Design a protein around this ligand. Structure first.
Ligand code: CO
Ligand code: CO
Lengths: 275, 276
């Protein structure tokens, strides 16, 4: 009988237009419309499963922010991450008496700065990632792109730590990872290659981890309100509607990438778990 | 074999620059409340007076678009205000060239947005060439009684009532040779559901590509490409821009953007002359 933990990995801020495109459009009466700098949670999920511990997303690297940080100053200033040491992934796991080395599977929803930050920790895991996302991030690396949402220093470490990669092929079916745990191949949308998770918990029932395939309940609607951070608009719309169908058909909850209200309600790792 | 191409000034529009250039000015830690700008841009149409028959690219906005009594919804008028003196109305521009709507053989609708398809209803004697996916999407807006957005219900109503003669460009259809040196380019989905361009080969001026809203401005075009906020198919949009770039390179054509203010300034308008 698995136990699922929600781990609080701090907070990030950014232009609300990244989150919800064209939220406050200029008008003839408000020609100089202003945006907001909204705050949202970064979190990860540990599924402690008989067949092996599964980790979904990894938040940000502890060495991300500041003048000796891995993130470019441009990135630090557009997407600032605020976190106490207790929020650091290694510490959240430590609190749960789980060692990095105990993780069998890490599912990378995508390789953005606030999701792939600590991949490098898990040298004993199989890292599951969409092949298109992997290819895209590696090109950023090879092209020496030191700005944007893909952190050169993070990728550098993934390679140096000799991580064990399992790429989900573009046209690959869902992957049964363990009893009641399936990796969903969302494909291109928010990013080059998005992965989700369906978890069937004996008590709680069905859970869909959407990650950045759906930022918030506002994104979800209906109607859908798409983000400014977006690669494949058609694929993004398709993915959201596909999630809506799966949720309906499997009677699952949809856990968004960073819904403040929803995260608030979650039972965090410090208080307990889901079963 | 020896045409005259005219650029017709059909007024100005204003809108949030974020529509034009996606996330042009993002907020940061030390500028959290970054503000946008209401940017003005030209609306124009192109008449190709060709021996085989007159060809019109785009139709601007309907004369009865703006105002309390206007066809455009309030919310639309506020976000996308059109300002035009009577001189700017397409029917007047054509008149000052001694061209009647009835003389137009073909209208090419780049797409069916408010500032491109506003005067389709005038050309009851023409074949209206439009992308089938754009036509389908617009008709759905109509049938769904959608009153707000960039597809004007009252305009579509008029197209149907005036019994326009339609020639849809199929999704996988090759370019169309409308006339000697005039090809309809099938750009497919991107900015909108179905985009059409034009390649014109003029004896003197050489090659011209009318991109319309496939490329808003030189800023859009880059490199680097800066996509718009008004977008349907991001991947298709990017594909189309790069395709236009290649065609321009290989055919040595100028690229005429949808609404580039600087380029528009440089144009010889219909009050001054034409391109041969
Ligand atoms: Co992301
Ligand atoms: Co348009």
């Amino acid at each position: 009988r698995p136990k699922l933990y929600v781990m609080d990995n701090g907070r990030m801020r950014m232009d609300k237009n990244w989150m919800i495109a064209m939220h406050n459009p200029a008008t003839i009466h408000n020609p100089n419309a202003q945006t907001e700098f909204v705050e949202f949670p970064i979190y990860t999920v540990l599924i402690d499963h008989p067949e092996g511990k599964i980790l979904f997303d990894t938040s940000c690297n502890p060495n991300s922010m500041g003048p000796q940080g891995r993130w470019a100053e441009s990135t630090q200033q557009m997407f600032p991450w605020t976190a106490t040491e207790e929020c650091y992934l290694h510490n959240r796991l430590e609190q749960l008496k789980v060692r990095p080395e105990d993780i069998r599977y890490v599912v990378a929803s995508h390789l953005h700065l606030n999701h792939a930050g600590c991949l490098e920790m898990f040298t004993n895991a199989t890292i599951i990632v969409h092949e298109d996302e992997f290819n895209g991030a590696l090109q950023c690396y090879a092209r020496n792109q030191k700005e944007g949402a893909y952190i050169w220093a993070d990728i550098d470490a993934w390679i140096k730590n000799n991580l064990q990669w399992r790429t989900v092929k573009r046209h690959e079916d869902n992957i049964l990872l363990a009893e009641g745990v399936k990796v969903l191949n969302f494909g291109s949308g928010h990013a080059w290659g998005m992965l989700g998770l369906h978890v069937e918990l004996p008590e709680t029932g069905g859970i869909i981890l959407a990650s950045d395939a759906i930022y918030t309940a506002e994104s979800y609607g209906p109607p859908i309100k798409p983000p400014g951070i977006i690669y494949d608009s058609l694929g993004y719309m398709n993915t959201v509607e596909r999630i809506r169908r799966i949720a309906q058909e499997t009677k699952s909850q949809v856990w968004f990438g960073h819904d403040a209200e929803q995260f608030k309600k979650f039972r965090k790792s410090t208080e307990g778990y889901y079963e």
